[PDB]
């Protein structure tokens, strides 16, 4: 009993749940096609500025709609009309609704004319920055980077003083937001102005009272170093960066560690030896353990980007004496991060120096108590085999694969079955058949179905790596041998194997040794086997030629429709109608 | 600003207190520091057709803070009247949960924040209050949340129930806390949403007071 | 009448942990009635099965449970009750195990637990959740009215007793159970209440359970019962064990709890029992699954 569109849209706003309600707000664009171009401005838009207290999912879809609404108002000639309904959404209490509206504001800025830009959008940054509600003050920090170059040289000064008054605002929250968008601002100015205007703002933030401001200013330091010349780098950037690496809140010393690699690539090599390598030494051995794990994972990308005159030298004098002490600290987490990368050093070091000065420490990880350590050591060893031979280290992980393949907790056992195919292709066939076959075949009988599941699909890749014939030699005479196991779960495992292998074992094999095994099991007492026989038979069916479908599988499927078990019947009947058999 | 029956449910919610107005009151209460976000003028009040009512603010909530950097407060409303007001008395009869759970016409609802503090990034201390209305009753809940990241959690809930036309309204103050070292079996993903973790916090203080209506 | 077209579809939606709407549950519980209406109070199930106990709306832990014993219908399953009332996804949990029964009348067998009743579902959570998920009690009525049709006990290969609670003094032979009327809300007394509320322990004879309803039986009871009807052991789940399964009464009765870290209380390991072709038992311990507005608030 309502009236023209706006009312019928609000009648849906009083509906039960979100999706039912939200669905109409996604029609807010389609409603504006029916509405005249002006009707979208005259009637629609003013309703969307007196905001509506409502769930995030809707206000978010509302903000997205505004960022794609230029063509509906009449074109960029009237883009200024989208600003009021966005400013309100750039101030709602919920944070995500604010950033989405901000992003929509950053979008329609490009659509503004240079005259309309200075008269509508640039003032919009002021009302958000100078606004009382601290929420708007957060939103303002995100709109500076899109406008500052698009304006006149003088009004640029107003924005810089504005953005500066934001980094020194009383509220700590806005100081964070200003620190986050710092690099985006320094990136968007001229060269000489960032040296004098931004570096002050940058320093006072990296020494703030609240730790949340400190680390947020750090990640923006890289964005500054990407711009400055090498000379002015030690003069303005490093002073604050040097202290931030010693902040009593590990949250800060973590950021530089998680970004240590992104620093050297932007600061320079000689400055990496003057100031970075010194700090790295003390970061690998700082109090809170979380910081060490971060930097430990970055030992590889740090060594690689080092210059060529010292790559081999500074690693075995300033880096290694701290590595061994890391591998020997009881913190099971820090060694999990080192394990994934420590072996990426042999190609950077050499051949004689690594097997003699880098290998004996490697074993301590391969025999560590933590299962997660020796797991990561085994996935990142390809960078080792291309410098030192396989057997020089192959004869050592012999029991390491065993304890993981036979651990007491099944989560560990699964984790290594995923790495077996990668590991199989690096030891070749001659190794596997002698040692790694007794372990991989004992997985298809594991107590947990998850391992029997993984061990099944693990054979698909074990064939893709070795060849169609390796199954006919070491696998299939063993899989087919499980079909006599009493436990009906181990009996079914064969049927899941024949499904997988068929896809990657050609035709001549699925018909020679896999097909007669399936049809033999069609008389098992438990029906769980029999209806899966029909499932498997239709799975491998289209692989084999027609002569063998009409020969031995069809008489079974017809026979299986007479199994009183109602489950097989639907599957048996299904398995013929699936592939062109009555 | 709502109105149902002989009641006047006033709604007030705005921005935080300015920086200068913080130190001014920080000395009025002799508090070395106020919350990071002090929602001073944010107030949720309900008046009667006679002159008395209850008010939930932050200023009176920060008075109840005793000799602190967590802003823990046992505030449960500030009795407001015009020399003729409602009385407080301990009681045996308390709120009945099976009633509210019943789905009825939701009349009005506004969540009103009182303060929030990030606790030097060591936790969160938020004091909020929300209230709904039913056709034959109104219900409110005032809850001070506290999460000291790595140490403990504390929730000081305070509910207010009034069956419409029932000469009295109820108030129950629940305050439960626990050091996380004792609730290891709880996933930390719930240390942020209070409505889901309150069940796993042991009661420390329970009080049920009935607020009575005078006559004239 | 291929209505199995959508039955399989519902399970795929339930395996993604997404609700079944009111109009959908109305039709589902209707079929489940016709399937359960024919099952005797003592439902006999064939030799090769996997038997699990309580789940309590711990859907994400039920899926972890499937990766242990096997997915359905590949694995013959047997549930001993308590599908709801202490997890967050009590709706999705029971909605799946019911749809699987309607699909595979023979691959799974679901029993009635002490929480499969309108009395208790209203306080421990199932009803409160059924509202938050749909906005009314219709779904709750559809399920609760169906819970009355769940069999009380189960009897594998003629040898093993499977129920939720324990034994009863009014019940000495299985023929007695087959004579009861199990089409009512779980009573407060009588043998039907005892079967779903009794618990075993060390103290001999009958005793007063601290939970009021049911009783407390020991070695002298189980021996005198199992040897009187020809049984190897009894399988019960109402309790919970840090070990997931507990042997008691000189291995005359086994407990099987299949909900790991029960409401974040004891971090218990959840276990299940697998019965291969012949009846040789083998348990499987497992751990929890790790993966991760205007409201009528209280
Ligand atoms: Mn209980």
Residue numbers in the entry:
A (entry chain A): 8 to 589
B (entry chain B): 12 to 78, 109 to 257
C (entry chain C): 4 to 295, 304 to 309
Text from the published report:
TIPRL (target of rapamycin (TOR) signaling pathway regulator) is an important PP2A inhibitory protein and forms a complex with PP2Ac together with α431, excluding both scaffold and regulatory subunits. Structure-guided studies reveal that TIPRL inhibits PP2A by perturbing the phosphatase active site, and together with α4, exhibits a robust activity in disassembly of active PP2A holoenzymes in a highly sensitive methylation-responsive manner.
The conserved concave surface of TIPRL cuddles the highly conserved C-terminal peptide motif of PP2Ac (PP2A tail), and HW2 and HW3 arch toward and hug PP2Ac at two separate binding sites near the phosphatase active site. The highly conserved protein groove of TIPRL is largely positively charged (R144/173/184/200 and K171) with interspersed hydrophobic patches (T138, L141, F180, and I147) that mediate a specific interaction with the similarly conserved C-terminal peptide motif “D306Y307F308L309” in the PP2Ac tail. The carboxylate group of L309—the last residue of PP2Ac—is nudged closely to the positively changed side chain of R200 in TIPRL, exhibiting well-defined salt bridge and H-bond interactions. This interaction elegantly defines TIPRL’s selectivity for demethylated PP2Ac. HW2 directly contacts the helix switch of PP2Ac. TIPRL binding near the PP2A active site distorted PP2A active site loops and metal chelation residues, thus perturbing proper chelation of the two catalytic metal ions, with a misplaced metal ion left several angstroms from the active site that would not confer any enzymatic activity.
